[PDB]
C-alpha cells in the first residue's frame, strides 16, 4: 500500500551555507596567488579606540587565467539541486535532482556588473531577499551574454542596442514585480568607495575601474566607457587599503560576458508610481549567490 | 621636477636626537615618494629608508633597529627624518630625495626606488 | 641583504677616452638598477635607471646596460665634468631593503 513520492525540499539562496563557504574559499584562493605589497587595515580594542596596521610582503605578480572550479559533496551528505522554472530561489522546489558537484564556475570579484557567470534558460529573471524592503540588493540574472571588452587604451566596449535591449527587458521584469503602470528609471550610483561608485573588477590580476553612467541613464552603435586600472584600491576581502604591484606588460586586454547586475531600488514612501534603480554590489558574496541559488547541501538520511 | 631643500647643519650631544627637514616644492607632494641617503665622512651612500607619502607608510633599512622614523606632512609638502640615541660615528652627511610616482591622488603608482631630485644635505656632527 | 660589488675600485682613463665601470648584485635584480655621480661637496646626480633608461639631461655619453646580477655603465668620451664617483643601487627587493654600490672614482690619467 505504501506509495512512491519526490522528495521535495525547501531553498533559500539568501541562508545558504555553501556561500560563506565559497567567499572564504575564494578569499584563500587569493591570499595565496595575489598578496597586496602593503595592506593598511584597522585594529581596534573593545573599549573602540583603532590603530591603523601596516603589513609589508613580497607581492609578485603572475599572469593569471581562470581556472573553473565545482564544489562537490563529501562522503555522508548530498547537493540537492533546484531544477524548477524561473525558480524564485526560496520555498519549495519541486522538479529536484542530485550532483556529486555543482556545474562549473569562473569566479569574478566585481560590482554592478556581473561577469562570465551561468545565463538563465527561460528568459531574464530578478531575484531579491525581499523587494518590499529596498535595503535588499536585486539579483539580475540574464539569459543572453553582453559582450564587453577592454583595453589597456583605457576604455571598455560593448554594443549599444544590445545593452539598450538588456534594459528594455530587465525593466519589463521589474514591473512584473512591482507594478505594469508603474515606471522604470535606471539612475548611477548614490555614491561611496570608487569600487562602488564604478563598474569595478579584477581581470588578469588587475583592479578596472570603468565609469557606468552611460550604462545606467535610461528612460523606459558601440557604447564605450572610460576605465582606469588602479594600483591603490580598497580590498574586498577586508576593511583596508592595499597597493599591488604595476602592471607586468602594458595595454591590460580583458574579455568577458556580462551575464548579469546588482540593482538596489531607492526607498521612497514617495507615491508616484515610479520606482528607481541604481548600480549595486560590494559584498562578493551576493556574487556568489548569482551562481549557488539553486544548490543546497543535506545529511543523506 | 621638484625641488628639496634641506635644514642647516647641526652639531648633537651624544645619546640625544637630530629630526632634518626636507622642503619639497614645484608640484603636487603626494605623488613623489621621498628617501633618505646618509653619507658619513669618507665613505659612499647608505640607504637608510623611503616613505610612501600618498599611503603615509614608511619603510628602514634593517639595521637602524627603531632609531629612525621618516615622516611626512601634506600640509606643508616636508618630509622629516628623525635619529634618536645619536652616536659619534652617526656624524655624516644627510641626503634627502624623491621621484615622480604617477597619479597617485587617482590610484596609480609606479612604486620607483630610484631617486631623481635630491636636496643640498645636511651635515650632523655628533660628538661631546 | 643583496649585497652590491663595483669594480674597479679606482679607474685611470685619459680625457676623451672611453671608460666602463662594472657593479654586480649578489643576487639577480631584474633591471631596478640605477647609476648616480658625486662629485666632491655636492650632492649625487641620477644618471641612468631602469637599468638602460638614461635619465633627462644626462649626456648621450652616459649609457647603462645589464640586467640580472651583472650591469655596467660607460661614457663614451671623458669630459673633465666626468671625472668623478659613481655608485650603483639596486631597488628590486621588496619588502624594500635598497642598498648601493661601495663606489667606484673615475681619476685622469696622466
Known amino acids: 500500500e505504501v506509495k512512491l513520492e519526490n522528495v521535495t525540499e525547501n531553498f533559500n539562496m539568501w541562508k545558504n551555507n555553501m556561500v560563506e563557504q565559497m567567499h572564504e574559499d575564494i578569499i584563500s584562493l587569493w591570499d595565496q596567488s595575489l598578496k597586496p605589497c602593503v595592506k593598511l587595515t584597522p585594529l581596534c580594542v573593545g573599549a573602540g579606540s583603532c590603530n591603523t596596521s601596516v603589513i609589508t610582503q613580497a607581492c609578485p605578480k603572475v599572469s593569471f587565467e581562470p581556472i573553473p572550479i565545482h564544489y562537490c559533496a563529501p562522503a555522508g551528505f548530498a547537493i540537492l539541486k533546484c531544477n524548477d522554472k524561473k525558480f524564485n530561489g526560496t520555498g519549495p522546489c519541486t522538479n529536484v535532482s542530485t550532483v556529486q558537484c555543482t556545474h562549473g564556475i569562473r569566479p569574478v570579484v566585481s560590482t554592478q556588473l556581473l561577469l562570465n557567470g551561468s545565463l538563465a534558460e527561460e528568459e531574464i529573471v530578478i531575484r531579491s531577499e525581499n523587494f518590499t524592503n529596498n535595503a535588499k540588493t536585486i539579483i539580475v540574472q540574464l539569459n543572453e551574454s553582453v559582450v564587453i571588452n577592454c583595453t589597456g587604451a583605457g576604455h571598455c566596449n560593448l554594443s549599444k542596442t544590445q545593452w539598450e535591449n538588456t534594459l528594455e527587458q530587465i525593466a519589463i521584469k521589474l514591473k512584473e514585480q512591482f507594478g505594469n503602470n508603474k515606471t522604470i528609471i535606471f539612475n548611477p550610483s548614490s555614491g561611496g568607495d570608487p569600487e562602488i561608485v564604478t563598474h569595478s573588477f579584477n581581470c588578469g590580476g588587475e583592479f578596472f575601474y570603468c565609469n557606468s553612467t552611460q550604462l545606467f541613464t535610461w528612460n523606459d552603435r558601440n557604447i564605450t566607457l572610460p576605465c582606469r586600472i588602479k594600483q591603490i584600491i580598497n580590498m574586498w576581502q577586508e576593511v583596508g587599503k592595499a597597493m599591488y604591484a604595476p602592471p607586468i606588460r602594458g595595454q591590460i586586454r580583458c574579455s568577458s560576458n556580462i551575464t548579469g547586475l546588482l540593482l538596489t531600488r531607492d526607498g521612497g514612501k514617495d507615491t508616484n508610481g515610479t520606482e528607481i534603480f541604481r548600480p549595486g554590489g560590494g559584498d562578493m558574496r551576493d556574487n556568489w549567490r548569482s551562481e549557488l541559488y539553486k544548490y543546497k547541501v543535506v545529511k543523506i538520511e | 621636477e621638484v625641488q628639496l631643500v634641506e635644514s642647516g647643519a647641526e652639531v648633537k650631544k651624544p645619546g640625544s636626537s637630530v629630526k632634518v627637514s626636507c622642503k619639497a616644492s614645484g608640484d603636487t607632494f603626494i605623488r613623489y615618494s621621498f628617501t633618505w641617503v646618509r653619507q658619513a665622512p669618507g665613505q659612499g651612500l647608505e640607504w637608510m629608508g623611503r616613505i610612501i607619502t600618498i599611503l603615509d607608510v614608511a619603510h628602514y633599512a634593517p639595521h637602524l633597529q627603531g632609531r629612525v622614523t621618516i615622516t611626512a606632512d601634506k600640509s606643508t609638502s616636508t618630509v622629516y627624518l628623525e635619529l634618536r640615541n645619536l652616536r659619534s660615528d652617526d656624524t655624516a652627511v644627510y641626503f634627502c630625495?624623491?621621484?615622480?610616482?604617477?597619479?597617485?591622488?587617482?590610484?596609480?603608482?609606479?612604486?620607483?626606488?630610484?631617486?631623481?631630485?635630491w636636496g643640498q644635505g645636511t651635515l650632523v656632527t655628533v660628538s661631546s | 641583504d643583496i649585497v652590491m660589488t663595483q669594480s674597479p675600485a679606482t679607474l685611470s682613463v685619459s680625457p676623451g677616452e672611453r671608460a666602463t665601470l662594472s657593479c654586480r648584485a649578489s643576487e639577480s635584480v631584474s633591471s631596478d638598477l640605477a647609476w648616480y655621480q658625486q662629485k666632491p661637496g655636492q650632492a649625487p646626480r641620477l644618471l641612468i635607471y631602469?637599468?638602460?633608461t638614461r635619465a633627462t639631461g644626462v649626456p648621450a655619453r652616459f649609457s647603462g646596460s645589464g640586467s640580472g646580477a651583472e650591469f655596467t655603465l660607460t661614457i663614451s668620451s671623458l669630459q673633465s665634468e666626468d671625472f668623478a664617483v659613481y655608485y650603483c643601487?639596486?631597488?628590486?627587493?621588496?619588502?624594500?631593503?635598497?642598498?648601493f654600490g661601495q663606489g667606484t672614482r673615475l681619476e685622469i690619467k696622466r
Open positions: 630625495a624623491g621621484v615622480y610616482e604617477g597619479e597617485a591622488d587617482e590610484g596609480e603608482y609606479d612604486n620607483n626606488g630610484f631617486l631623481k631630485h
Open positions: 643601487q639596486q631597488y628590486n627587493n621588496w619588502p624594500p631593503r635598497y642598498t
Open positions: 631602469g637599468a638602460s
